[PDB]
Design a binder for these strands. Structure first.
Ligand code: NI
Ligand code: NI
Lengths: 107, 237, 572, 333
DNA sequence: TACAAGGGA
DNA sequence: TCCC
């Protein structure tokens, strides 16, 4: 549920085809204790969209797909109720592990 | 009332198998007999004809599993359904009932198991991307629900037409066929027999080459396969 | 009928031994010296089995141990089946059409069918591959060893020493043992074998050997053997004196490198007779552009026949004159020189040409195979040859069973119900590698253009290739040493190159430069002091004749190779 | 029912003898048999008499000696000859004991002596023993010849073991699989399928056979006998043997289980194998630290272990396909 | 991973 | 003491 798309977008920052290697954002978002730092980390991760799209357009492969706003609000509306950090940890690590999948983008 | 193949019904295919086996009988039966003395139990060529006829009738009963056949009718994928397992359950139980012997039904269950293609377990080097793997076999095994309701009826019908002695049908739920197939496969994999099993059961596999005759095929080497379809002519001309 | 003999050979000495096979039997042993020429071992029982249908046995299998004239055996079986087709019909035209089709070489390709054919010729190299392989077409699996069980499998001198890769008597003992409980008749043909093997592979089978009564066996005649110096110039005087007479010279090399140069250095210094219709016709050794029959059926001529360790078995040359050969491990030599078939005599001559020991580095591995090779002066053309090999290979090697890369364990646990060889666990079975002969000068543009995977796009079945003619296009390459690749590597259905990190055996391979029609290429005090020497290898690649202490072989070619780093101290 | 009693010596050696009982039984027949564990006794119930038991045992040891003679005072590179015998003198001692047991056995004669048990079949034994204020000369611990030989057969036919050379020294990891509740014939033959002969791995690139847990993970990667213990409880007892400067000793005796590791592997490999076996092999060979993190995560169910393993794999050479990520997420639940 | 320290016939 |  709305995890595959954000997983692909995050993997766009790790694939060798994108010679930028933004590991700080994924490392920070993986190690999150509560709401504020994870929100800041995901914001920093999604802030790098223009450079990814420009690099993809200049390389010739199809541009990356930014997560749709329809499921953008899903992250928020599910995350406020996660007062306990424990059940937050499973999703915080699920996004990180989905960020490291193959996700063949530019053939 | 059921259909085995996508292009052919149950009868128009199984009758072709049985009819071809009548010609190939005098060619391949004595090899089966010389193999089956080694097992420790032996009967005449006529009882061998009965055993082969039972294998011919019972290797496609599992095809009519009311879910796999639905996938066959359409183009839906089957993702590794081994109906030969349920067919081996049927063959084992029914041959318990008729032939009153324990090892020959085990051999026949294995013969049904290889039908189309045998299972592959252990000793692999990651060259089994397809369904040749016990995990997907167990997947299909637990996802197995049940056979057609008329399966017992037409099984009795073909039992009457081929032998006519007594009609009897085994009923697999899900766990019972699990126990039967796991027991038979594990025992065949490991016994004091080392090379005896492969020779014997491959020998019983060899006559089961009429599937190319049953359905139309476009293989280039099939004509070469037709070289050994008929034996040397007994009559000079 | 069984009494009627279709060939013009009348009745042989082993006519009464035919009934020992029957339909329910075990191991039956047949022995006769120089069986390569006049074999007639087990084809008559099968032929008499099929005269009025009522087949006792499904098929027949003839086994060539390592590398020999498979095409010659195929032609012989084709001629025999055509002859038995006589007196029954089939006119003249369509008999040969089916005779050519029922014979299958089965090199290993054409996965559509595993093993089919009324009579086929196989090789132990391919026989091992046949016991475990997957041939699935149309969701139908043809089990390659299924036909082996009920067919008559017959060996032919399968105790022949090779390039440290086939001479394993323990493997043969294991094979005969595992075949014993299958309740199938197994008969083996051999010229010379030790007495020690004849008891651990046949514990209750009597040897028929040669019987003084009913003297009808094909005698060899008079053969004289002498030790001569190995030089190219020395043998010349023995050539011009046989070619004019009408005889021929048969040169045998123990190394492919020596064979790929002997013909070239001998075809230019003679300049006496024709070359196109007579020369350029030799035995196949991973060359001739895949196929072998193109220069195999034309060998029936009294001309120069350059050869190597491939002509050792499977030859019925009627005119045998002088045979020169390199160092041989006695058992190889006696089989090679026993080529004088037909009528006894014919002034059969066989000699050995070795400079000192240089030919022992590829077919002897030093050891007793080369140390006792020079102690071979008797003709050994009788049935008492068994009293000769005991002190040549049994007293020094077979007692210590010193062998390298022996994979016996891969045939017991692996071969229980079913497995496959191309995907082993830890011990790959070194049998053969099939290369592809190309010569694209401007064509290479990555992916080798053609010969694609042909996936779901284009082909619905996604399993189709243009290798229909490739069945007679691959070589016979054995994995011995590669060091670095020289040809275009392959992974699946050619192309994709890559695989620069120790490419494995089997399949793949595509030879570009090595593709041509002509050829394809890239004890003094020790004996009198003690006995019971060691085996295996050490820092020096040769054996050790350990009399009391140390005493390695600072001799042969290993010392010359090792002298590149230490040439002092009299080469140790 | 025979209900043959099994001597109480060591729940490791007792396991070996009472668990080679079944392999001696199967070759002679003895259907409808079961093995009831008693913590350490491991009693067996069977409908067999003694003669068929003896025929099965002699058949097993005849195959054993046939395998022994295939390589060569004869020393063979076998599990019971040199693969597991850490001591050089045992390389010759064990085959002689086996052939003496045979020679006594085919002539319907019971044994009359006792023999010293190596540390291989029981790590609890050794050379000395503290009596009150010191040790005894020689080896105080000794066992009956028939029990010794049959435990050797059981060890050779069932229990996997892995050797790695690394020059002069040598690591030998020995594992024994133990039930605690109930087993039948089919289960025991499934366990038998796990045993693989001649695991002389040596080599230099395969250097991760140290860290015994990693070695057993690698061995279980290529083992596909059955997923039997997902319905039956089983444990694993492991130990290591070392040749550090010709100084042989046991330096590891941790006792965790085996069920959940292969359960996670089996739930991990539904999607495909072409990207599963190579995935594990690449993570083991390249990211040894990542493989250690992954195995710790499997052992103790911690979320960060999977992430660390995936990051270490991706950093060097691992593709980390999508389906394996989905399988890992499904394992997380 | 460098050093030592050991188990037996 | 021999035996790595
Ligand atoms: Ni079917
Ligand atoms: Ni079919």
């Amino acid at each position: 549920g709305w995890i595959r798309n954000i997983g692909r977008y995050l993997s766009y920052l790790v694939d060798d085809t994108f010679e930028e290697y933004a590991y700080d954002v994924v490392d920070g978002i993986a190690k999150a204790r509560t709401q504020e730092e994870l929100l800041e980390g995901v914001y920093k991760a999604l802030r790098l969209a223009p450079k990814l799209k420009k690099k993809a357009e200049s390389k010739g492969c199809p541009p990356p797909r930014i997560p749709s706003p329809e499921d953008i609000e899903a992250l928020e509306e599910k995350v406020e109720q996660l007062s306990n950090p424990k059940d937050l940890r499973k999703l915080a690590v699920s996004l990180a592990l989905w960020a490291f999948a193959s996700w063949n983008n530019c053939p | 009332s059921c259909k085995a193949f996508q292009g052919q019904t149950l009868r128009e295919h199984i009758e072709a198998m049985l009819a071809a086996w009548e010609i190939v009988k005098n060619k391949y039966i004595p090899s089966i007999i010389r193999v089956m003395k080694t097992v420790g139990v032996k009967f005449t060529e006529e009882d061998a004809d009965k055993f082969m006829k039972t294998l011919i009738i019972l290797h496609d009963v599992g095809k009519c599993s009311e879910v796999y056949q639905k996938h066959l009718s359409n183009n839906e994928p089957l993702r590794g359904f081994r109906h030969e397992l349920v067919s081996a359950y049927y063959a084992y139980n029914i041959l318990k009932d008729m032939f009153k012997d324990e090892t020959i039904a085990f051999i026949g269950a294995l013969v049904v198991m290889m039908h189309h293609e045998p299972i592959l377990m252990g000793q692999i080097r990651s060259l089994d991307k397809e369904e040749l793997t016990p995990e997907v076999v167990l997947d299909k095994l637990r996802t197995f629900n049940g056979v057609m309701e008329g399966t017992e009826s037409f099984i009795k019908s073909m039992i009457k037409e081929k032998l006519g002695v007594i009609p009897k049908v085994p009923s697999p739920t899900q766990e019972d066929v699990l126990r039967e197939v796991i027991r038979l496969s594990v025992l065949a994999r490991h016994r004091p027999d080392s090379g005896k099993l492969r020779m014997v059961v491959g020998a019983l596999l060899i006559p089961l080459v009429c599937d190319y005759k049953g359905a139309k095929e476009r293989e280039g080497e099939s004509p070469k396969f037709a070289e050994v379809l008929r034996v040397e002519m007994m009559k000079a001309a | 009928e069984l009494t009627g003999f279709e060939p013009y050979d009348y009745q042989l000495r082993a006519w009464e031994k035919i009934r020992e096979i029957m339909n329910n039997g075990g191991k039956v042993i047949i022995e006769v010296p120089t069986a390569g020429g006049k074999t007639e071992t087990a084809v008559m029982p099968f032929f008499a089995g099929i005269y009025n249908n009522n087949w006792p046995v499904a098929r027949l299998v003839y086994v060539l141990p390592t590398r020999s004239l498979v095409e010659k055996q195929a032609e012989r079986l084709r001629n025999l089946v055509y002859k038995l087709l006589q007196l029954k019909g089939k006119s003249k035209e369509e008999a040969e059409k089916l005779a050519r089709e029922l014979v299958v070489v089965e090199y290993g390709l054409e996965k559509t069918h595993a093993f089919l054919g009324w009579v086929v010729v196989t090789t132990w190299d391919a026989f091992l591959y046949g016991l475990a392989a997957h041939r699935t077409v149309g969701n139908r699996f043809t089990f390659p060893a299924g036909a082996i069980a009920q067919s008559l499998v017959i060996f032919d001198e399968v105790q022949m020493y090779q390039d440290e890769s086939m001479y394993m008597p323990r493997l043969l003992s294991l094979v005969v043992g595992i075949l014993e409980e299958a309740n199938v008749p197994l008969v083996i043909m051999s010229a010379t074998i030790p007495s020690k093997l004849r008891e651990m592979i046949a514990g209750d089978t009597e040897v028929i050997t040669v019987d003084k009564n009913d003297k009808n066996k094909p005698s060899k005649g008079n053969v004289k053997v002498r030790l001569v110096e190995g030089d190219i110039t020395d043998v010349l005087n023995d050539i011009k004196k046989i070619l004019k007479n009408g005889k021929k010279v048969l040169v045998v090399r123990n190394t492919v490198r020596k064979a790929v140069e002997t013909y070239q250095v001998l075809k230019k210094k003679l300049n006496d007779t024709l070359a196109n219709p007579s020369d350029a016709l030799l035995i196949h050794s991973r060359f001739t552009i895949g196929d072998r029959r193109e220069k195999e059926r034309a060998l029936d001529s009294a001309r120069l026949i350059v050869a190597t360790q491939v002509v050792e078995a499977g030859l019925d040359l009627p005119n045998v004159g002088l045979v020169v050969t390199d160092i041989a491990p006695l058992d190889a030599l006696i089989q090679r020189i026993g080529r004088c078939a037909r009528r006894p005599g014919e002034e059969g001559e066989g000699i050995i040409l070795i400079p000192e020991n240089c030919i022992e580095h590829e077919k002897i591995v030093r050891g007793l195979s080369e140390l006792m090779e020079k102690i071979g002066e008797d003709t050994v053309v009788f049935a008492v040859v068994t009293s000769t090999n005991e002190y040549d290979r049994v007293v020094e090697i077979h007692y210590g069973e010193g062998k390298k890369n022996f994979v016996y364990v891969g045939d017991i646990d692996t071969a229980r119900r079913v497995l496959e060889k191309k995907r082993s666990k830890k011990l790959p079975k070194d049998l053969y590698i099939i290369p592809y002969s190309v010569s694209p000068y401007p064509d290479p543009l990555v992916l080798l253009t053609t010969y694609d995977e042909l996936s779901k796009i284009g082909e619905y079945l996604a399993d189709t290739t243009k290798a229909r003619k490739a069945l007679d296009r691959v070589y016979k390459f054995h994995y011995e040493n590669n060091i670095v690749p020289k040809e275009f590597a392959s992974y699946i259905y050619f192309k994709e190159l890559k695989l620069f990190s120790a490419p494995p055996e089997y399949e793949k391979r595509s030879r570009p430069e090595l593709y041509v029609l002509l050829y394809p290429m890239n004890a003094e005090k020790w004996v009198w002091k003690v006995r019971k020497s060691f085996k295996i290898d050490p820092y020096e690649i040769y054996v050790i004749d350990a009399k009391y202490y140390n005493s390695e072989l600072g001799f042969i070619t290993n010392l010359s190779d090792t002298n590149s780093h230490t040439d002092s101290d009299s080469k140790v | 029912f025979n209900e043959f009693k099994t001597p109480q010596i060591d729940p490791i050696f007792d396991l070996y003898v009472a668990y080679g009982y079944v392999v001696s039984l199967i070759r002679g027949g003895a259907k409808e048999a079961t093995l009831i564990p008693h913590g350490a006794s491991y009693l067996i119930q069977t409908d067999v008499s003694n003669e068929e038991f003896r025929h099965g045992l002699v058949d097993a040891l005849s195959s054993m000696l046939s395998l022994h003679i295939a390589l060569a005072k004869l020393v063979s590179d076998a599990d019971f000859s040199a693969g597991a015998n850490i001591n050089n003198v045992y390389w010759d001692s064990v085959p002689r004991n086996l052939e003496k047991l045979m020679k006594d056995l085919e002539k319907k004669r019971s044994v009359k002596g006792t023999a010293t048990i190596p540390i291989t079949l029981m790590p609890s034994a050794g050379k000395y023993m503290l009596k009150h204020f010191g040790v005894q000369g020689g080896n105080p611990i000794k066992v009956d010849l028939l029990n010794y030989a049959l435990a050797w057969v059981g060890f050779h036919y069932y229990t996997p073991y892995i050797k790695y050379a690394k020059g002069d020294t040598t690591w030998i990891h020995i594992y024994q699989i133990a039930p605690v509740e109930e087993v039948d014939m089919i289960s025991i033959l499934s366990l038998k399928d796990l045993k693989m002969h001649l695991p002389h791995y040596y080599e230099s690139n395969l250097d991760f056979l140290i860290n015994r847990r990693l070695a057993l993970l690698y061995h279980l990667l290529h083992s596909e006998a059955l997923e039997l213990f997902t319905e039956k409880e089983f444990v694993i007892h492991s130990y290591t043997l070392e040749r550090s400067g010709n100084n042989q000793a046991i330096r590891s005796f941790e006792e965790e289980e085996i069920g959940k590791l292969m359960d996670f592997l089996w739930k991990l490999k539904r999607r495909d194998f072409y990207h599963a076996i190579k995935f594990i092999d690449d993570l083991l060979k390249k990211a040894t630290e990542g493989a250690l993190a992954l195995i710790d995560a499997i052992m103790n169910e911690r979320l960060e272990g999977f992430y660390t393993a995936l990051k270490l794999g991706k950093k060097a050479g691992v593709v980390s396909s999508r389906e394996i990520v989905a399988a890992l997420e499904d394992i997380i639940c």
